[PDB]
Amino acid sequence: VFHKIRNEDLIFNESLGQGTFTKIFKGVRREVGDYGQLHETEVLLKVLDKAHRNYSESFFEAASMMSKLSHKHLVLNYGVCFCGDENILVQEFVKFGSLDTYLKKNKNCINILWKLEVAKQLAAAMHFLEENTLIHGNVCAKNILLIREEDRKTGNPPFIKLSDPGISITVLPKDILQERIPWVPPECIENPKNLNLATDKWSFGTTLWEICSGGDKPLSALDSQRKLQFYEDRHQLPAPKAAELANLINNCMDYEPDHRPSFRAIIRDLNSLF
Ligand SMILES: CCN(CC)C(=O)c1ccc(Nc2nc(OCC3CCCCC3)c3[nH]cnc3n2)cc1
């Protein structure tokens, strides 16, 4: 179970946006930390809409399953306040927010080494999940959090974490899944029961496209029906302007799930582009 956090110790501040059937807020948690020292800690607060309390189980098991596995590239969940009528997940507050917004805002100031480093870290996370046979189910740039920016002073690389998957696509409405093309793989658009470790290899390739497309969203110009016909016609995504990773993107986004390479293989491919 998650460590239950008192409503009394949670302060909700500015709205940061919304997720799939969720409201997200910046907040502060009053807690007793190491050595009995009192802290007021910045927290990310994800609230499940009162209008969609049906997905609470998935909304919370998505964080639970990942939280039992500690890893430097996986987001830290502090606990949950079932604040009465509300279902609230309390998470590590990352300084620089989402990768997709960071890529858009800093498109002209991001080189290939920066993108390689971020891809290697994300693949390391996914490899760790693969070794544990844990399916994420929603790998995308929005679910990558920037802990530290690159530092030209000390040449330090950036550092990222993978966030929780949110409500599983197995229970999400059909219209939500279709909107998530091309992050949801073709076999899951055909049948969500096909959720598999191979799903995350496809989505990982889609996310590599985002990292190389400076924040663009692939197929954003296509409505849901045309996104479906994109999979029907078995099309592949266009090569990004920075095409250094185009081959890996296409190799991951294989219409045959069984042919998608292991994340061990993916990592060795990334290490070879130097
Ligand atoms: C100058 C503008 N910036 C940063 C360049 C910010 O406003 C900002 C936003 C969010 C954080 N922090 C954050 N964000 C998350 O998710 C991403 C958010 C979900 C809802 C959509 C908006 C992003 C998180 N998930 C788990 N811990 C999280 N911590 C820090 C800063």
Author numbering: 536 to 809
What does the paper say about this structure?
Four hits, i.e., diaminotriazole compounds 1 and Cdk1/2 inhibitor III, and aminopurine analogs Cdk2 inhibitor IV and 7 bound JAK2 JH2 (V617F and wt) and JH1 domains with IC50 values at or below lower detection limit of assay (3.5 µM). Since the compound binding does not induce significant changes in the ATP pocket, we compared the regions around residue 617 and the helix Cα between WT and V617F structures. It has been noted before that compound binding to JAK2 JH2 V617F can disrupt the aromatic packing of F617-F595-F594 and the conformation of F595 and F594 can be reverted back to the JAK2 JH2 WT conformation. In structures complexed with 6, 36, and 16, a WT-like conformation for the phenylalanines was observed. However, the Gln626-Leu624 switch is not present in the complex with 6 but the structure still assumes a WT-like Phe594-Phe595 conformation. Interestingly, the packing of F617 against F595 observed in the V617F-ATP complex was not evident in any of our structures and the residue often displayed poor electron density suggesting high flexibility.
